[PDB]
Ligand binder design. Structure first.
Ligand SMILES: Cc1ncsc1CCO
Ligand SMILES: Cc1ncsc1CCO
Ligand SMILES: Cc1ncsc1CCO
Lengths: 269, 269, 269
């Protein structure tokens, strides 16, 4: 895929306005919903065991996030995932905090055993503890803590689970069983807005609802989000993280196809 | 009622600063509270069964919203409603998603059987499944999917439950047992801000706390909110949904009596 | 302590970026996290009984808030507090609504019996019902409902629990077993932003993670927050509470040491 192609998937999402069902944490519910609305999609949050199966079956995509998990919410995520798997609705997982505490690592591993996933998104450490692999990294600072080792972790995980693995960082690495790509987009102010990464996972869900190949959907989602963020930072930079949060939402609704073609960097490895 | 009268109820709300108790969904808690504070009221959220009855009895109004309901939260809403009914505190209901899943339709019907309501607010479909009536509509696009049929649904529901029914849309229809009105106010950017409709339901609650006739309170609440939204969009328009959300809050605190008299359209049918 | 000293603790917080674990209400989760990120700290929310002990032990500080409490969340706060007490992590408590309903007063008293606290923050009424003392006051209006009586309540509570007591109001009163101070900072627009007080409690937590004497940490935290708020209001004033919320976040990230030295008023009694 290329910048031109990613830009086309963005226009598709806006034309179809897919329904994205989220079972997420309570620190990012409002931001995630506002971001999806700004982008042009339709968000819906539902967590009760008596309704998740019914809501998941009528959605375009299902997004699972364990940020502030509980025994009952993990049980609901699995019931919802099974329902989506039965009706052909792509499911995306964000294993927030996997590795930080055993309860999170356990819940993450349980979900991947019971639900077939179209994609998994998180930092290096979160992905390694979820799949149970090697190569350890949190995010990195400068120079280079290892690029080939991250590329290797991504491919190994993707091959074992037969899904798409997107490891985010200053440089994004995305891969499926037989392909690997590195992405250069975004701005550091995204680290000062809670839920920024989570919103990205939901946007990936929106793109998967309109593009059949999950690898292409993920690449187009991450490239579009990153360009919106950079353009927002240019207008937001020395004002602060408060103004950036608001301008990010504005840009998610005004970013064009030409913008993505000009500022998104996609490289096949 | 007229624009002049609606404008007077707004000044009343600001003078009394009523305490509005909300039992709502976790996607709109922060926005709903900030909007009520901006308007000039006092919000309070409490959901535990061991305290809802005590909190409801000291409030000026009670607002129930099933956006992200659970078995226990529906039970709490009913305990709270019964307490308010015992101490003369008006109760308002927003049956979010009624009809979307059977669990939501069931919970909505259970609440209206056990609690006496001053008003119910939602779209056409939500109102029809909650009361169990005819006439089906989601929101409409252009031309006219039927105005008289919506007017009929509103009056039928209002007569059966002896309460006020407010069906929102590009054109708002409000009615009680013997009166019907259509309202023309607002801006479409309200559809790009999550919780915008919910905030409106809470504002109706604030107005009911200071005006004895619930039909008049609802008309004045919806007219004032809509004018604040239009004035915000004029200053927010080509910047985006992010800037609009912030300007809506600003306008809820600066909108005047003259503003409402000039831009709110109220028509008795 | 003085303005010069408080300013130094601010730079410390930004250099260390402490991890602050919050077990709080769902009306202020997003705002609290964004404020901590803006300030320069690292927030983490976790509420499940199967993980709070593990998360608390690796944090720099623990913050407990009963704003929208439940039977299970109070149980979790206590398990988390015990763990922090075992690993030397300072714990801060915000007894939101203590006195409003017996369930809140009871839960607040249970926490102070089971957990050793570095500090407690709330209004006069909340502090009196939590500790079970005299002197009653909500916030005050003008003239003077009693300054010496508030000073007395603070010292009595601090002596009995051997902790720091911070009673907020137009004038802030902070004290420990043998010292008392009054602080003059902030702006009234903080009352129009939900979670403003709660964010302050979390900021106190961030400062306690880097300064050994909790009294000094609290003084420096409250002075810095108040100066950021005043500077934001100067740029936000006649636009509204919406713009202020956003500018407050901006200022929490741009406020300097010189700013605090110039606009914070600290007086030892
Ligand atoms: C997006 C969303 N999901 C359940 S409630 C809600 C807020 C708008 O009612
Ligand atoms: C409005 C509200 N209700 C319970 S907590 C809260 C946030 C301010 O403490
Ligand atoms: C700060 C925070 N705590 C648990 S989830 C979360 C949102 C970012 O994932």
């Amino acid at each position: 895929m290329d910048a031109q192609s990613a830009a086309k998937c963005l226009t598709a999402v806006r034309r179809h306005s897919p329904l994205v069902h989220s079972i997420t944490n309570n620190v990012v519910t409002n931001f995630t919903a506002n971001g999806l609305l700004a982008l042009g999609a339709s968000p819906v949050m539902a967590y009760a065991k008596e309704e998740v199966a019914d809501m998941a079956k009528i959605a375009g995509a299902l997004v699972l996030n364990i940020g502030t998990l509980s025994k009952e919410s993990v049980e609901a995520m699995i019931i919802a995932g099974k329902s989506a798997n039965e009706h052909g609705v792509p499911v995306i997982l964000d294993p927030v905090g996997a590795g930080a505490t055993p309860f999170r690592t356990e819940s993450a591993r349980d979900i991947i055993r019971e639900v077939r996933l179209a994609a998994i998104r998180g930092n290096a450490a979160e992905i390694a503890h979820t799949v149970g692999v090697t190569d350890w990294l949190i995010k990195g600072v400068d120079a280079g803590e290892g690029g080939g080792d991250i590329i290797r972790l991504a491919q190994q995980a993707a091959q074992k689970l037969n899904t798409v693995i997107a490891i985010t960082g200053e440089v994004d690495v995305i891969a499926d069983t037989s392909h690997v790509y590195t992405l250069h987009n975004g701005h550091k102010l995204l680290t000062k807005v809670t839920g920024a990464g989570c919103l990205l996972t939901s946007v990936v869900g929106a793109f998967c609802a309109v593009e059949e190949n999950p690898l292409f959907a993920a690449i187009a989602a991450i490239s579009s989000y990153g360009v919106a963020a950079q353009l927002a930072a240019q207008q937001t930079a020395d004002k602060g993280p408060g103004s950036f949060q608001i301008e990010l939402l504005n840009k998610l609704s005004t970013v064009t196809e030409q913008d993505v073609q000009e500022w998104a960097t996609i490289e096949r490895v």
